[PDB]
From a paper:
To enable our functional in vivo studies of AlgL and delineate the role of this enzyme in alginate biosynthesis, we first determined its structure, minus its signal sequence (NHis6-AlgL28–362), to 1.65 Å resolution using selenomethionine (SeMet) incorporation and the single-wavelength anomalous dispersion (SAD) technique. AlgL crystallized in space group P212121 with one molecule in the asymmetric unit. Although we cocrystallized the protein with a mannuronate trisaccharide (ManA3), we were only able to detect electron density for a sugar monomer suggesting perhaps that cleavage of the ManA3 substrate may have occurred in crystallo or that the remaining sugar units/moieties were disordered in the structure. While this ManA identifies the location of the active site, we anticipate that it will contain multiple sugar-binding sites given that AlgL’s activity increases linearly with the number of residues in the substrate. Indeed, examination of the enzyme’s surface electrostatic properties and residue conservation revealed an elongated, highly conserved, and strongly electropositive groove. In addition to the pronounced, long substrate-binding groove, we also identified an extended loop that partially closes over the ManA-binding site, known as the lid-loop. Similar to Y246F A1-III, the sugar monomer modeled in our AlgL structure occupies subsite +1. However, this monomer adopts a different orientation; a variation that is most likely attributable to the lack of additional conformational restraints that a longer sugar polymer would provide. The conformation of the lid-loop correlates with the presence of a ligand in the +1 subsite, with the lid-loop in the Y246F A1-III and AlgL structures in a more enclosed conformation, while the loop adopts a more open conformation in the WT A1-III structure. In our AlgL structure, we found that the Nζ atom of lid-loop residue K66 interacts via a hydrogen bond with the hydroxyl group of the C-2 of ManA.
The alg operon also encodes a periplasmic lyase, AlgL. Characterization of this enzyme in vitro demonstrated that it preferentially degrades nonacetylated polymannuronate (polyM) via a ß-elimination mechanism. The structure reveals that AlgL adopts an (α/α)5 toroid fold with five pairs of antiparallel α-helices. Our in vivo studies demonstrate that AlgL does not associate with other alginate biosynthetic proteins and functions as a periplasmic homeostasis enzyme to clear the periplasm of accumulated alginate to prevent cell lysis.
Residue numbers in the entry: 28 to 44, 47 to 362
The structure:
Amino acid sequence: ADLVPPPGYYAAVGERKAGSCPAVPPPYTGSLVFTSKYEGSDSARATLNVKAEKTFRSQIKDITDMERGATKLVTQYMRSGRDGDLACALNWMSAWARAGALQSDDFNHTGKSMRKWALGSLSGAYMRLKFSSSRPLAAHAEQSREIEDWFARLGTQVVRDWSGLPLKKINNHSYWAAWSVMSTAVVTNRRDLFDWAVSEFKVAANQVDEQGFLPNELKRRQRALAYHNYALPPLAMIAAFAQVNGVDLRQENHGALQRLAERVMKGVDDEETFEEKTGEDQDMTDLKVDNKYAWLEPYCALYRCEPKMLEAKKDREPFNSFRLGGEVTRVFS
Ligand SMILES: O=C(O)[C@H]1O[C@@H](O)[C@@H](O)[C@@H](O)[C@@H]1O
């Protein structure tokens, strides 16, 4: 059977009551060898290097602008239905597609991370255009084909980028990569990509220990809780997408996805168990950011959320997360 997204992705284009179309960021065709924002850290890779981060953000500026700008345009279109926003979004994505952006075989860890992040953002947003009951892509077949072929090329490459690794090298980056590949799989109806994403979820589920911790995220010391929370959105999205395609992953490794989510939310309330496990007081900075809990939307579509969990979701809605394609609450409501 053809691959499908969760039913919320079939929502009609809205008509809520007008921005213009900015120039497309220059397609990034360069090598993907970038500076790490943690350059100079020890094995925990948790010491921010402000100078390196500045260099990193500068190196990836056109990619960042593309990610944020294109998802914003799709969000605007799905909200208000102005054809100009659709036209602009498709112009941006098809320009990058035709150029073959982000396809470099020259990359380091940071660079391949950028490839999968951008793929997830753009395909995640495009998903709404593709499956909307309004069929907005009907009048844009040539551009649609160009964009989808590009996603397929990138998706195949992302599988290459994160395959062949042992568990100690499989962390939140692989989970995010698997989301990008799942998203691409459904846009492109590619079962092989779907299957890879499912396999990666299963690896993650089996990495969740008996208490709900992930060893490789615990290694990030004072950022441990933050990185556990960072693992949740791609894993929950993969499971929600897999479920409607006939693959139920909710019980993998004794309901590992639930065990991880509950451990995280326990730690958000009381930092104790994470400090005890890491031996360092946790940086709570990221845990204060509402949109970093966007995983609650697919999570509560999968599981019967207890009142604490439901309350956590309601108090932070609506969720916007460009790495998940934009309006997460809308596509699960
Ligand atoms: O420092 C690393 O290992 C990675 O850390 C992650 O948080 C990301 O910042 C990624 O871009 C880096 O390459």
